[PDB]
Write a protein that binds this DNA or RNA. Sequence first.
RNA 1: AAACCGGUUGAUCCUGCCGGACCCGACCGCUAUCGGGGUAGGGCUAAGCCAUGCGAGUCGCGCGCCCGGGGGCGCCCGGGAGCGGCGCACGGCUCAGUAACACGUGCCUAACCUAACCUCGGGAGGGGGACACCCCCGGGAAACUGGGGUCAAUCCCCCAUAGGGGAAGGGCGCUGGAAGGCCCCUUCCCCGAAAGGGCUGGCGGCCGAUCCGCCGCCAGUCGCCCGAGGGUGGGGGCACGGCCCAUCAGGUAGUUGGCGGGUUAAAGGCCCGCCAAGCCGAAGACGGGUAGGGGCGGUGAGAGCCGCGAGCCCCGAGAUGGGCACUGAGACA
Lengths: 236, 144, 130, 157
Amino acid sequence: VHLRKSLAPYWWPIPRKAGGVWAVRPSTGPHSLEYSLPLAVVVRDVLRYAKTLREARYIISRGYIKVDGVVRKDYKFPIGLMDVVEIVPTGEIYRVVPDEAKYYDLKPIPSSEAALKPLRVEGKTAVSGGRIQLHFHDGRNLILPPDVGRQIKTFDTVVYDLENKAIKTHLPLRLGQLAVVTHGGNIGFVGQFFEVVWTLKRRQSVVALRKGEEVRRTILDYIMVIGTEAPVVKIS
Amino acid sequence: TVVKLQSRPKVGDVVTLPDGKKVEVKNIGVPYVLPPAAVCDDPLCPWHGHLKIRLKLLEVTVEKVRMHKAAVVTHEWVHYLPKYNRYERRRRRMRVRVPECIEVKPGDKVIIAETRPLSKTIAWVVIGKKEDVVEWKAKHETLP
Amino acid sequence: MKLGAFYKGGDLVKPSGGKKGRVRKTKKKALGGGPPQIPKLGEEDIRYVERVRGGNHKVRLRQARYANVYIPKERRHVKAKILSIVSSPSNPDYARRNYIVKGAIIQTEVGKAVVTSRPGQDGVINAVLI
Amino acid sequence: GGLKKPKKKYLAGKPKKIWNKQLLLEELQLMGEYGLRNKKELWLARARLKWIVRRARALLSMTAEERAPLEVPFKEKLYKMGFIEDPNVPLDRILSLDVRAILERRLQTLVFRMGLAKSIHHARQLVVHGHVLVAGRRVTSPGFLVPRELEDKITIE
RNA sequence: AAACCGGUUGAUCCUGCCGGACCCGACCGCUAUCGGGGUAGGGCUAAGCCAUGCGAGUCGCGCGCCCGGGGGCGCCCGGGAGCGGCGCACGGCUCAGUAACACGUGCCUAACCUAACCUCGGGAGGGGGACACCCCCGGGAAACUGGGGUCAAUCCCCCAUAGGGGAAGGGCGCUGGAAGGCCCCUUCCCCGAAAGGGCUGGCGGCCGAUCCGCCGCCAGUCGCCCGAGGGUGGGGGCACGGCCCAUCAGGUAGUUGGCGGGUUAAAGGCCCGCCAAGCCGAAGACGGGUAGGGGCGGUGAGAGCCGCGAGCCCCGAGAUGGGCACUGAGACA
Ligand SMILES: [Mg+2]
Ligand SMILES: [Mg+2]
Ligand SMILES: [Mg+2]
Ligand SMILES: [Mg+2]
Ligand SMILES: [Mg+2]
Ligand SMILES: [Mg+2]
Ligand SMILES: [Mg+2]
Ligand SMILES: [Mg+2]
Ligand SMILES: [Mg+2]
Ligand SMILES: [Mg+2]
Ligand SMILES: [Mg+2]
Ligand SMILES: [Mg+2]
Ligand SMILES: [Mg+2]
Ligand SMILES: [Mg+2]
Ligand SMILES: [Mg+2]
Ligand SMILES: [Mg+2]
Ligand SMILES: [Zn+2]
């Protein structure tokens, strides 16, 4: 599979004319192709540690880069929203957080925060033994007993412990919580969920966030609750 | 196959035909179209069968009812021509599936919902007449 | 299978009855079909597992002797023997040539039964007593 | 199906009727005054002037609110280039600009006007042969449009 | 620069056509010093015919063998012919076919499949077999290819369990706008997994220099199988939008629809059996002509006109013409 540079996603931090005709294609991993950046692109164009694809692939193949608590030795590994990126020989820890200008940026985060990931619940399924499988925004799954799975609804958020494989906390989608827009145009805006128009399709409901007097609107699919008035994890 | 009712039932109740088969009026997911005043046993019906419709509806007018369980409806809209700064009224005839419980005539205005393909030319089904539409509004909640 | 001899692709005829040109010269392998594989009434059950699209498998009953006949009036399942086919309402040629299809009436040792399964697609004859 | 290719930038300055005696006389006067190589240079200068004037016309045609975030930076950029002398003049005065203001910003013209060359053609020869330094670097293009801040940093070898 | 000029009269005002002046594209003539930037160049012409060379490999950390150097513990290094895995369905070309769900925009699949990768939960037990390279012989002009012997596997197969599918009945529960779906219970029939394999280090034991291995445990690591979701690719459906001609007015008979089936991964006259007469058309059917569609490009002050709609990107189709299949997740390559 190839990725022509013209068909590369528009938000990617690469030049559109100066360069080759190809771009590094993400390797079908734990995100969306159009909402993720390959690890080699992160190493070469986002952190500037490697000057070529060869040097970036060397750095990745040594195992110096860790994504969400797991060493990633594939240079095409997708990196997406809220992922924790950890550099081993340097000790620097970033979170892939929504950004107003670059649309997705690596912001440094504390080491205590590096083991948590805020994952937006994307759906629920019934699996064998009567258990509930929660599907999150990046394709991750969690199988839980039916009673705990009953009270978690779609579009909720869970702060999830990567190291324990557990749900550290659950943040339900209620009016007045703090939410961040993770998608289109109004990206990166943090504000209070204060207004909803419930369309017939729940994913397409109109949501309005407020930051003092700053009112932005999106659809319900494009927001993620990151807690009450103070965000649980450092996003900015 | 079809039984009429003196009053229109609701989404959910079960009515047993003279054959003894019980038909439960299914929720089609459209809250602003009332179920018909008759119940059929058709397994391709969206009200009394397993047929599933999408959220694409259209207002059409019935032109020809002579095929069995189908009709020819006309679709009308307006197209803008920029060079003349003027409009043109366009139309296109469509073939749709009319269930047994929903009796239609030429000139009638009905609603059609898109489904999976049922024949060579039919992929829309009559969900109800225009008199079966009720008013519907979204939920509007704000934080003071 | 996926055979060009049993192509399931589009027609060249418009709804207005006129012809239309061929957008694609070759026949897609994805649009190919296969010949009928309904069982023939025989002396022993012969089953054949076939590879299909995407590497999945389909069990074909190339010859059928026994039927899983269900008596709802007893709520019981019995593995009966098919003496003959009484009728094939979809096509009488099936019963005439002793082929078993869905909706076919079969005279098994428990009585008359309607075939409630697709024997060419399921590989078994599930039947319901009448 | 169309592939974009670059077009001539002096077309907006080039006239459509070259065989007018009055137009030929004025163009010949300008060419001889500023020592231009050919008519293409004069037409390029006129194209620059036409861009400036049409930008002024467009900003005038926009409303006051739209014009507000663009009017001051536009005049500031013209002043910094050296085409306009007062950056706070009204916008409609920009409509009356002249190509001689643009021709004055040529490096050869500035080398002649600073008295560094015996003539305008000698200034062109200096810039071509590379004896003109702009803030330390050799600028060898006689048609370079020097800005106001770089005007005083012109030297000879 | 939102421009006019020459021409019909003996002269005059009109109409109205033709020419001039500008830009762009193709070919052509005369002439031609340098540099930079750019996705220019058998498209506009035969999808006409081709000599010659090159244009998809990689992996010894899947596997046995052979050869050479080194060394004693259990091998180290290098090479060879192969088996085996993965890839070759991407990438490159061109514009015949196509007026079409081809293409574009906006939506679907609750009617579907998907190797590689991600995550969550679970599993990896017993047994068997063959074919290369190779050795001994060849056959054939070459292409290619035969017999015997013999060592392996992450090669091939059986067994068990897990799991899966069909039919039927029931249900708190899940998703979702809506269950023909998921989960749970019940019954029968049917199909039916896996490589604990490689490496590293440690431990123990068997074994022998005619060996440099085999076995049992542990940790690390790359792997294998099942269930669910995602990801990616793909199949399919829908509404609308974009050519000329009436010196083309009636067209259609599997044609239009219904019912029951077969096939498919999956809906569908996709195909089949029966039933009805339906379907399209002057809001232009049908017929003919032209053409790959789009982003886009040239020109004009603009509306607009044109396609130089060749080159660059996206989708489509094709590989001398016409057909049909194997393998495989995916081709009718
Ligand atoms: Mg069809
Ligand atoms: Mg005269
Ligand atoms: Mg050619
Ligand atoms: Mg390995
Ligand atoms: Mg080798
Ligand atoms: Mg290709
Ligand atoms: Mg294997
Ligand atoms: Mg299941
Ligand atoms: Mg088995
Ligand atoms: Mg084995
Ligand atoms: Mg079917
Ligand atoms: Mg047909
Ligand atoms: Mg004009
Ligand atoms: Mg080319
Ligand atoms: Mg051919
Ligand atoms: Mg071929
Ligand atoms: Zn009905």
